[PDB]
């Protein structure tokens, strides 16, 4: 931060220097996707159909 | 020969140069005046009021 000198009855000020940390936050996204059983049925064949 | 008037002979040294500096100029009445609001350049994030 800056500074600013001023007389009278007024303290003398010095500059002040600031620290922060912050931190993460985890979140997720979720999709479904469904295969019905006959098709699992025909695309397991294994060369026989 | 006593003009009332500036004069200042010889006074040697000096430095005339301008620069350029960016700042707004109104007109009000017949005289240009400067218009300046420095809030942010001077009195900003220090604790003086």
Avoid: C, W
């Amino acid at each position: 931060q800056p500074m600013i000198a001023r007389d009278g009855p007024h303290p003398v000020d010095q500059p002040v220097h600031n620290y922060m940390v912050k931190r993460i936050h985890k979140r997720s996204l979720s999709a479904a996707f469904a295969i019905a059983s006959e098709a699992l049925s025909l695309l397991s064949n294994t060369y026989v159909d | 020969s006593i003009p009332p008037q500036s004069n200042s002979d010889s006074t040697t040294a000096g430095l005339p140069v301008n620069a350029r500096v960016p700042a707004d100029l109104v007109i009000v009445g017949d005289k240009l005046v400067f218009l300046e609001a420095l809030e942010r350049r001077v009195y900003q994030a220090t604790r003086v009021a």
